[PDB]
Every structure is written in structure tokens, then in C-alpha cells.
């Protein structure tokens, strides 16, 4: 089997992407944030504290003839940005782009933190990291990909995120028309539950490539590119007036700037992030100070190849017995 679904930016800045997902019978379609950095499929629901729902579409398990309470199961998750959610668990039929999993754990939110409430466009998350990170207790549950994998034509999914435009998540096949040149595959460590890999270096603009190992995670659920302070300083030093602001929370730059590109290495291959991908616009409405899309990972404890990086590539998440990651230009 295969599946193919379009993923759409939630706003004009590509702060996140949403992908429609069919849950239950008859189908209830919710727009979920596909997140290769976590491993829970959770939704706003009829059980979510009413004051914490503000415009999201909810899953109502009582209206699904295939929903079954997973007795005694609870879940609770906290994300890197400080947001969180928790609740109980149903199993139900879940389909993405024509690919159907029966008995998928659908984690129903009883509580969500303010950032979730405040974002009306995201109805929940669909985790695509390794199932070892799943938070369901006392019986850990599998991700949608893990459940689908054996049925897929090939045990892979691909992320093809757009810059200020829709893109595609495919399951079970590689669309050879979706990228240019060849796909370069690179080793993955699953030890921390992530799609963790080591970039071979970077360049800023037309500058020379610096060969240096940068361990980090391919994370579709993180907006920005978080890299070591040395790398980030080298990038922003090429932008007149750019500075790190502790009050704002990162590097900012004059909105009048033209940003240089940023290149990262994948083995001997190179992925070029155009300068415009690194512009996240004014820090506050009407400001001429703009927020940068490359930020320091210092104090995160891990480097994160988020959407800023991934949207410059066609990315293969290869879930074979020994997982790997592939990157192609597009």
C-alpha cells in the first residue's frame, strides 16, 4: 500500500504545516501537524477542557463506530517549545492520503497548554519519530508509520515541504519526479528516539564550505534551524545589523536586509537553503526588526534540522531494519 497527502503552511511564514487526517467511522477529518520529532498522535477532542478549545476541529470518539477506549491508558507530553498536552486513549481507524491503519492509538486531549489553544489551525499532532518515545502509559503505543510499515510497498515515508506553498507527505514510495539529481543517504542513530544524523558541514552564502560534523535531528515539527552557536554566529555576521537579542529570544536582523543562503552537508552532497527561507518577518506587527530562521541550539542540548532546513530538500525517512535518512535537492 501507499499514501499521499498534501501538507499546507498554517500561515504566511510557514510557522508549521498541517495535513488532513481521517479518524474514525464515519471519517472525522482533522488537520494535524506531522512531527518527525515526536511519537504521539494526539487530537483535540470532545473530552478537551472547553475553555482550552478555540476554533480547532475536535475528534468525538462517541460518534465513531470503530472507536474503542484503550482501558486504563493515559498520556502526557511536553515539547521543546514548552508546550504540553495530556489525556486518555482510544484506538480507531486512521487514514492519511489513502493509507489506512486500523487499531491506531488516537490520544484524546483532556488538557492542552495555551499555545495549542491559541493556534486555531492545528487540531493535534501526528508523531513520526520512533515509537520508543511514545508517552502512552502503562502500555506504550506505536506511531502511525510503525503500524503501517509492514503493509507499505517500501518501509519509508518522505517529507517534501514547500516554501510559502503546499507540499507533500508520501508513505510507502519515493516519487522520483519530486526531486532533482540523486538522493544521498546518511546514517541514523535511533538511540534517543529521533531521526538523528550527522551533517558533514556548512557554508554561508558563496563562502567556502567548512567540513565539520554536526549531529542533529530531522524534525518536521520544529519551525527553525537550530545549530551550534559558532555556526550561527558565522551566518549572522554576514548580515549588516544582525544581532542576538536576549529580550526578543534570538537573532534578529533589519527587515531591509537581503539574507545570504546557508548550505548544509549530507555526506559529499550539499543542500542550499535560500536566504529568503531564513526570514521570519517582523518580531511584532509593524516592527522593522525581523526574526531569523537560523538560531542557536545552545541550551537545547541537541541541534535541530527543522522546517527551514527540511523545506529546502526532498527528505526520505527510511524505516528499513537499519533506518537511514536521504536528502535530495529539488
As a whole number of angstroms, the distance between CA 70 and CA 73 comes to: 6
Helices (H), 188-261: 229-236
**Long-range CB contacts (within 8 A, 24+) of 228-236:** 228/296, 228/297, 228/298, 228/303, 229/296, 229/297, 229/298, 231/202, 232/294, 232/295, 232/296, 234/204, 235/204, 235/260, 235/262, 235/294, 236/292, 236/294
Helices (H), 131-170: 144-148
Whether 90 contacts 49, CB under 8 Å: no
As a whole number of angstroms, the distance between CA 307 and CA 219 comes to: 7
As a whole number of angstroms, the distance between CA 251 and CA 244 comes to: 4
Whether 39 contacts 126, CB under 8 Å: no
**Of 229, 218, 157, 123, the residue nearest 1 (C-alpha):** 157
**Of 89, 83, 93, 70, the residue nearest 21 (C-alpha):** 93
The Cα diameter of the chain in Å comes to 60
User: Cα-atom radius of gyration of the chain, to the nearest Å?
Assistant: 20
Whether 190 contacts 244, CB under 8 Å: no
Whether 103 contacts 199, CB under 8 Å: no
> Residue 327 half-sphere exposure, CB side, CA atoms within 13 Å?
27
Where in the sequence numbering do the catalytic residues fall? 35, 199
Helix (H) or strand (E) holding 114: helix 114-118
Amino acid at each position: 500500500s501507499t499514501g499521499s497527502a498534501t501538507t499546507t503552511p498554517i500561515d504566511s511564514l510557514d510557522d508549521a504545516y498541517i495535513t488532513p487526517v481521517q479518524i474514525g467511522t464515519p471519517a472525522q477529518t482533522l488537520n494535524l501537524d506531522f512531527d518527525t520529532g515526536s511519537s504521539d498522535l494526539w487530537v483535540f477532542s470532545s473530552e478537551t477542557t472547553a475553555s482550552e478549545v478555540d476554533g480547532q476541529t475536535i475528534y468525538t470518539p462517541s460518534k465513531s463506530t470503530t472507536a474503542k477506549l484503550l482501558s486504563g491508558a493515559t498520556w502526557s507530553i511536553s515539547y521543546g517549545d514548552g508546550s504540553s498536552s495530556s489525556g486518555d486513549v482510544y484506538t480507531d481507524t486512521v487514514s492519511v492520503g489513502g493509507l489506512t491503519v486500523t487499531g491506531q492509538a488516537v490520544e484524546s486531549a483532556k488538557k492542552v497548554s495555551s499555545s495549542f489553544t491559541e493556534d486555531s489551525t492545528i487540531d493535534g499532532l501526528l508523531g513520526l519519530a520512533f515509537s520508543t518515545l511514545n508517552t502512552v502509559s502503562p502500555t506504550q503505543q506505536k506511531t502511525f508509520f510503525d503500524n503501517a510499515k509492514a503493509s507499505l510497498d517500501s518501509p519509508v515515508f518522505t517529507a517534501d515541504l514547500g516554501y510559502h506553498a503546499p507540499g507533500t507527505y508520501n508513505f510507502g514510495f519515493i516519487d522520483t519526479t519530486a526531486y532533482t539529481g540523486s538522493i544521498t543517504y546518511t546514517a541514523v542513530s535511533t538511540k534517543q528516539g529521533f531521526w538523528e544524523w550527522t551533517s558533514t558541514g556548512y557554508a554561508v552564502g558563496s563562502g567556502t564550505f567548512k567540513s565539520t560534523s554536526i549531529d542533529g535531528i530531522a524534525d518536521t515539527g520544529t519551525t527553525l534551524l537550530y545549530l551550534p552557536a559558532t555556526v550561527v554566529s558565522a551566518y549572522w555576521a554576514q548580515v549588516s545589523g544582525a544581532k542576538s537579542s536576549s529580550s526578543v529570544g534570538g537573532y534578529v536582523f533589519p527587515c531591509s536586509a537581503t539574507l545570504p543562503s546557508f548550505t548544509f552537508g549530507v555526506g559529499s552532497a550539499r543542500i542550499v537553503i535560500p536566504g529568503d527561507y531564513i526570514d521570519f518577518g517582523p518580531i511584532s506587527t509593524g516592527s522593522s526588526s525581523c526574526f531569523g530562521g537560523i538560531q542557536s541550539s545552545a541550551g537545547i542540548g541537541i541541534n535541530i534540522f527543522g522546517d527551514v532546513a527540511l523545506k529546502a530538500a526532498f527528505v526520505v525517512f527510511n524505516g528499513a531494519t537499519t533506518p537511514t535518512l536521504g536528502f535530495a535537492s529539488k
